[PDB]
Amino acid sequence: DKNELVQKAKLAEQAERYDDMAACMKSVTEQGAELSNEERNLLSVAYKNVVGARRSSWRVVSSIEQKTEGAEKKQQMAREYREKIETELRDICNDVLSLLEKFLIPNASQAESKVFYLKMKGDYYRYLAEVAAGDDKKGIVDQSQQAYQEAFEISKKEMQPTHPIRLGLALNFSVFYYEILNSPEKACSLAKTAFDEAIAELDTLSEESYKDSTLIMQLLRDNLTLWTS
Amino acid sequence: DKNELVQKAKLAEQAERYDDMAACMKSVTEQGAELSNEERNLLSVAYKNVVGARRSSWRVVSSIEQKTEGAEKKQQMAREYREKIETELRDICNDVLSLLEKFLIPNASQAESKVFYLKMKGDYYRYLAEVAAGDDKKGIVDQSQQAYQEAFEISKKEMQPTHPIRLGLALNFSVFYYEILNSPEKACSLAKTAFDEAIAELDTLSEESYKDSTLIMQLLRDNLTLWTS
Amino acid sequence: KRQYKSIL
Amino acid sequence: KRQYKSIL
């Protein structure tokens, strides 16, 4: 039953066994019923760590491969290893994207969950864009941007500027502009507006989520500081 | 070829992909030729991290299972999950122990490598002892102690008291006495003698390994401090 | 190693 | 979480 798999996912998280956590949460999602906020967060944490391990390995192996320019045997070994890690990463992203298309997005009957999932779709296309072949990149970048843009419109209409999901979407979409589209001014503008609109309506913070909101606001401003410096 | 697998293991280590690192080093060991110092260290680092992840998960899940005494459904879930992690851990230990028996120990033609491998055998039986059924525990504890004792005799005869492998063996064997045999006085005695005999012949440190030796000496003394406090 | 952050 | 250490 669903509740047992969720409890198993919480145990796996504590044990730092993210593949087990992800398998539990994917089994829960596959039952087809709309996820609770808690279940949604567990699925997200599991996959973030599963793909995260590959993103980090990819950065390390990519850096080595560049440093070994003019070192034939070493460079080739690093290229092939990078390609192996890339394959794993793409499979993970595609698995999440498939859950999003088959279950999560169509069953989302609430604005908050629609935004969360569309943001997640933007993130996972963004992770695919980080490793995309020059030829596939455009399409992948477009899919990420459209998912974030749709999430953005809904959050702007339905949520207060201090809502953590609205703030987290602005944070990740601003990073998408900066790192993926190489548009630092649209990145800064997006992050500044999100921060400023939250400060201007800080009385809308709730005692339940004010620390979640203010943490994301700190990240927005820190990125803004980095990017305007 | 062996050299390519070793280079692949170094790349995997950098990427923090220890299962890949272990598979490379196990393939190298299976070729049947005596390992170099570098190869021996790579095999050891790979397996230490592979089993390490399970030892850490086991401690976390064991702690939860104890905290959930009087909480039926939670306790049982934690027990079953602990049993699953235990199975993985035992398989890893048995895989290393099998390499040790089939290749490493019989091909060790040098005292230093004999000590290293016999110490490794003591360590992996010690990891099995940490998860042993009351009924299997005695035999496992005996196998760990005999491997450490044989390594100890050889190191005492062939190595200077400042040799890092001799010091590392004293450190792990002292931990075996303290944690596995519950004999803190023999643990302290073993650690104190090792530290004191190294201080007394510190002029035997080499510029190549003095920092490796002194690091292990710090660990010996820190354990001694903890255990005598 | 990236200076700017995304969520988490 | 163990206070005393083994190698590494």
Residue numbers in the entry:
A (entry chain A), B (entry chain A): 2 to 230
C (entry chain B), D (entry chain B): 1006 to 1013
Extract from the study:
progression, programmed cell death and cytoskeletal dynamics. platform for the binding of numerous proteins. dimer, and each subunit contains nine antiparallel α-helices. classified as binding “mode-1” (RSXpSXP) and “mode-2” (RXF/YXpSXP).
interaction between the α4 integrin tail and 14-3-3-ζ. contained a single copy of the 14-3-3-ζ/α4-30pS complex. a high degree of disorder for most of the α4 sequence. position, which is a proline in the optimal motif sequence. hydrogen bond involving the Y128 side-chain hydroxyl. to 14-3-3-ζ in a mode similar to other 14-3-3-ζ/phospho-peptide complexes. that significant secondary interactions occur in the 14-3-3-ζ/α4 complex. interactions presumably too dynamic to observe in the crystal. phosphorylated α4 integrin peptide is weak compared to a longer one.
